[model samples]
Target: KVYGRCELAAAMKRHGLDKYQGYSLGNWVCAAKFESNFNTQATNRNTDGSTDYGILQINSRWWCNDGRTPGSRNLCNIPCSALLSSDITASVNCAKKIVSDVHGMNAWVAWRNRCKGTDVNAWIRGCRL
Candidate 1:
């Protein structure tokens, strides 16, 4: 299902995106906004053999195993399908793993290009926090 902007923000906040890895909730909201537009089933294929999946677009190359990404690491130790589930539990856990990586939030190019160093308050302004 597709989530409204504030709904997505509140959901991410509940999942601990608020100050997760030293990044604010807005950062996470903004990334999701640009990455998948709050759609749980979102998926994007890359030029490489890898594909990005789910709301945060967790990657098949290093985070999930899609049985298609060459040399998949499956670092999140999850099937790519799990990320597409509306439940979002696996997606939230995998997102924590991604942020915990050496790249931190920079792992998501959308975060780097659009969310990083920006006043992302607008992303969560209407959310209940």
Candidate 2:
């Protein structure tokens, strides 16, 4: 909640997401805005009982696990709680791994459903970082 989209973009740049997986900073910022509105603790339980985690909403299906939640491949080898923390380092790292396989931001359904083919510049329109 404390981080704005621009601040998130700066942090992404700090984490090397500014040019990660062939996606631009604007791409990351736009997806972050719609997915969690910059809320680090964001979580959304899917209809299938899977859950999405953190600002990037990395899914329980392959990225992380809640321990009690069974059938988690936990591909990122990170605890789901880690993504909910103020530190987005783990989330960004996992996200990078995700995009590498999916070939782009197509991994995030929200990005395709909402931010794709849209003007992403406004997500970083004004920033000092």
Candidate 3:
């Protein structure tokens, strides 16, 4: 079933992102638009023919093999597909941990700011709430 606004909101809450509902919704919809057109079961092939799965466009191998563990059974060590399977918020949180740890929130904000004017859609695709 296609996840609607309320469903997405609940999912975001599960990931500790209830505060940024506006940004989260914008980012989620935009990411889905670009990544897989919001296709929940979407999967893509890498250059090496590996698979990237789900609505947030997570790569199962990368998530399982490379990403750091979050330490919460409900939140940590989860594959992107698993996160996607449960909720978009979880997937987003997992992504935040993976990317924010390296780039920081300011980096994401800067990216959002930069893209907000020139290409709002692209900005939404890349930015996080």
The sequence of per-residue lDDT tens digits that candidate 1 reaches over residues 1-129 is 899888888788778778877787888889988999889999999998899999989988899889988777998998999999886789989988877754598888898999888898889886676
Give per-residue lDDT, candidate 1, residue 39.
93
| CA lDDT, every model vs. true structure | 0.86, 0.83, 0.48
Worst 10 residues of 2 by lDDT: 95-104
TM-score top scorer: 1
What is the overall TM-score of model 2 with all chains considered together? Answer: 0.92
Sorted on lDDT, highest at the top, how do the candidates line up? 1, 2, 3
In candidate 3, stretches whose alpha carbon ends up further than 4 angstroms from where it belongs are 5-14, 18-25, 65-76, 79-81, 84-86, 101-129
TM-score of 3: 0.51
Query: In model 1, which regions exceed 4 Å deviation?
Result: 101-103
Estimate the TM-score for candidate 1: 0.93
The residue pairs in collision within model 2 are none
lDDT string, candidate 3, 21-123, tens digits: 3343344444555565555667776665445556666654445422332331222366545644644655675656545432332323323454233444342
> Which parts of model 2 are misplaced by more than 4 Å?
none
Worst 10 residues of 1 by lDDT: 94-103
